Design a protein around this nucleic acid. Structure first.
Length: 67
RNA sequence: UGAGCCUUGAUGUGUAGGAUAGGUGGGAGGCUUUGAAGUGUGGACGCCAGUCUGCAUGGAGCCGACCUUGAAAUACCACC
Protein backbone atom coordinates (compact mmCIF):
# COMPACT_ATOMS: atom_id res chain seq x y z
CA UNK A 1 0.00 0.00 0.00
CA UNK A 2 1.98 2.95 -1.32
CA UNK A 3 1.15 6.31 0.28
CA UNK A 4 2.20 9.86 -0.64
CA UNK A 5 1.27 12.55 1.89
CA UNK A 6 2.51 16.10 2.44
CA UNK A 7 4.15 17.93 5.34
CA UNK A 8 2.74 21.01 7.06
CA UNK A 9 4.25 24.45 7.67
CA UNK A 10 5.65 23.38 11.05
CA UNK A 11 7.46 20.34 9.64
CA UNK A 12 5.70 17.44 11.40
CA UNK A 13 5.13 14.71 8.79
CA UNK A 14 3.70 11.21 9.19
CA UNK A 15 2.31 8.71 6.68
CA UNK A 16 0.48 5.39 6.72
CA UNK A 17 2.27 2.19 7.73
CA UNK A 18 -0.82 -0.01 7.97
CA UNK A 19 -3.35 -1.41 10.39
CA UNK A 20 -2.63 -3.43 13.52
CA UNK A 21 -2.96 -6.64 11.49
CA UNK A 22 0.71 -6.35 10.52
CA UNK A 23 3.03 -8.01 13.04
CA UNK A 24 6.05 -6.54 14.81
CA UNK A 25 8.78 -7.35 12.29
CA UNK A 26 6.65 -6.20 9.35
CA UNK A 27 5.88 -2.93 11.15
CA UNK A 28 9.57 -2.39 11.95
CA UNK A 29 10.70 -3.13 8.39
CA UNK A 30 8.02 -0.81 6.98
CA UNK A 31 9.25 1.92 9.33
CA UNK A 32 12.83 1.26 8.21
CA UNK A 33 11.86 1.35 4.51
CA UNK A 34 9.99 4.64 4.93
CA UNK A 35 12.87 6.09 6.97
CA UNK A 36 15.48 5.22 4.35
CA UNK A 37 13.25 6.36 1.46
CA UNK A 38 12.82 9.68 3.29
CA UNK A 39 16.49 10.21 4.22
CA UNK A 40 17.60 9.40 0.67
CA UNK A 41 16.06 12.76 -0.34
CA UNK A 42 17.66 14.82 2.45
CA UNK A 43 18.10 18.37 1.11
CA UNK A 44 21.19 20.48 1.72
CA UNK A 45 18.95 23.22 3.16
CA UNK A 46 17.80 20.93 5.99
CA UNK A 47 20.75 21.77 8.22
CA UNK A 48 20.58 20.03 11.59
CA UNK A 49 18.79 16.91 12.72
CA UNK A 50 16.58 15.51 9.96
CA UNK A 51 14.40 13.03 11.90
CA UNK A 52 13.71 14.28 15.43
CA UNK A 53 10.76 12.33 16.85
CA UNK A 54 8.04 10.13 15.33
CA UNK A 55 4.65 10.04 17.06
CA UNK A 56 3.66 6.52 16.07
CA UNK A 57 0.39 5.42 17.67
CA UNK A 58 -2.70 3.24 17.30
CA UNK A 59 -6.39 3.41 18.26
CA UNK A 60 -5.28 3.12 21.91
CA UNK A 61 -1.63 4.11 21.55
CA UNK A 62 0.54 7.11 22.34
CA UNK A 63 3.25 8.86 20.35
CA UNK A 64 6.68 7.56 21.41
CA UNK A 65 9.90 7.89 19.45
CA UNK A 66 12.13 4.96 18.46
CA UNK A 67 15.66 4.50 17.16
C1' U B 1 8.76 39.61 39.29
C1' G B 2 11.43 37.47 33.58
C1' A B 3 13.19 32.31 31.16
C1' G B 4 12.34 26.66 30.72
C1' C B 5 10.83 21.59 31.16
C1' C B 6 7.34 15.03 30.86
C1' U B 7 1.70 15.73 31.53
C1' U B 8 -3.48 17.46 31.25
C1' G B 9 -6.84 21.35 29.20
C1' A B 10 -9.35 25.95 26.70
C1' U B 11 -9.51 28.93 21.13
C1' G B 12 -9.69 27.56 16.05
C1' U B 13 -16.90 30.85 10.88
C1' G B 14 -11.88 32.23 3.80
C1' U B 15 -17.16 31.63 0.78
C1' A B 16 -19.82 27.40 -1.24
C1' G B 17 -22.42 24.98 5.25
C1' G B 18 -27.30 21.69 10.18
C1' A B 19 -22.47 25.85 12.02
C1' U B 20 -16.86 29.24 14.74
C1' A B 21 -13.78 24.01 8.48
C1' G B 22 -5.97 23.91 10.60
C1' G B 23 -4.22 18.81 9.50
C1' U B 24 -1.61 14.01 10.27
C1' G B 25 -0.88 7.97 12.51
C1' G B 26 -5.00 5.68 13.07
C1' G B 27 -9.46 5.89 10.56
C1' A B 28 -16.86 4.24 9.11
C1' G B 29 -18.50 3.66 14.70
C1' G B 30 -15.58 5.59 18.97
C1' C B 31 -17.56 7.35 23.80
C1' U B 32 -21.59 7.05 27.38
C1' U B 33 -24.83 1.68 33.61
C1' U B 34 -15.57 2.77 35.27
C1' G B 35 -23.75 6.77 33.56
C1' A B 36 -24.90 9.92 27.07
C1' A B 37 -28.56 13.55 24.95
C1' G B 38 -32.25 17.73 26.97
C1' U B 39 -32.58 22.07 31.71
C1' G B 40 -31.18 26.92 35.58
C1' U B 41 -26.22 28.58 36.34
C1' G B 42 -20.05 29.98 36.70
C1' G B 43 -15.51 30.74 34.25
C1' A B 44 -12.32 30.38 29.84
C1' C B 45 -12.64 31.60 23.77
C1' G B 46 -14.52 33.92 19.62
C1' C B 47 -15.77 36.81 13.27
C1' C B 48 -21.48 38.92 19.93
C1' A B 49 -23.82 33.72 15.91
C1' G B 50 -21.79 30.20 19.19
C1' U B 51 -17.78 25.77 21.77
C1' C B 52 -15.54 22.96 26.77
C1' U B 53 -16.05 22.12 32.15
C1' G B 54 -17.91 22.73 37.99
C1' C B 55 -22.88 22.85 40.61
C1' A B 56 -28.03 20.50 40.97
C1' U B 57 -31.70 18.37 37.31
C1' G B 58 -32.17 14.35 33.68
C1' G B 59 -30.12 9.75 34.39
C1' A B 60 -29.95 6.96 27.91
C1' G B 61 -27.83 9.94 23.04
C1' C B 62 -25.40 14.88 20.50
C1' C B 63 -22.58 13.02 16.99
C1' G B 64 -20.97 9.84 10.30
C1' A B 65 -18.95 10.24 4.74
C1' C B 66 -24.11 13.43 7.07
C1' C B 67 -26.64 18.44 2.77
C1' U B 68 -22.80 21.55 0.94
C1' U B 69 -17.51 21.69 0.31
C1' G B 70 -10.29 23.68 -1.53
C1' A B 71 -9.08 21.28 2.87
C1' A B 72 -13.99 16.76 7.56
C1' A B 73 -15.09 16.10 11.50
C1' U B 74 -13.78 18.51 17.63
C1' A B 75 -17.20 10.15 15.64
C1' C B 76 -12.60 8.54 19.37
C1' C B 77 -7.03 8.08 21.17
C1' A B 78 -1.61 11.13 20.49
C1' C B 79 1.21 15.04 18.03
C1' C B 80 1.98 20.01 16.93
Amino acid sequence: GQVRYRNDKNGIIHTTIGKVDFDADKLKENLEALLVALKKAKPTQAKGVYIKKVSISTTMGAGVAVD
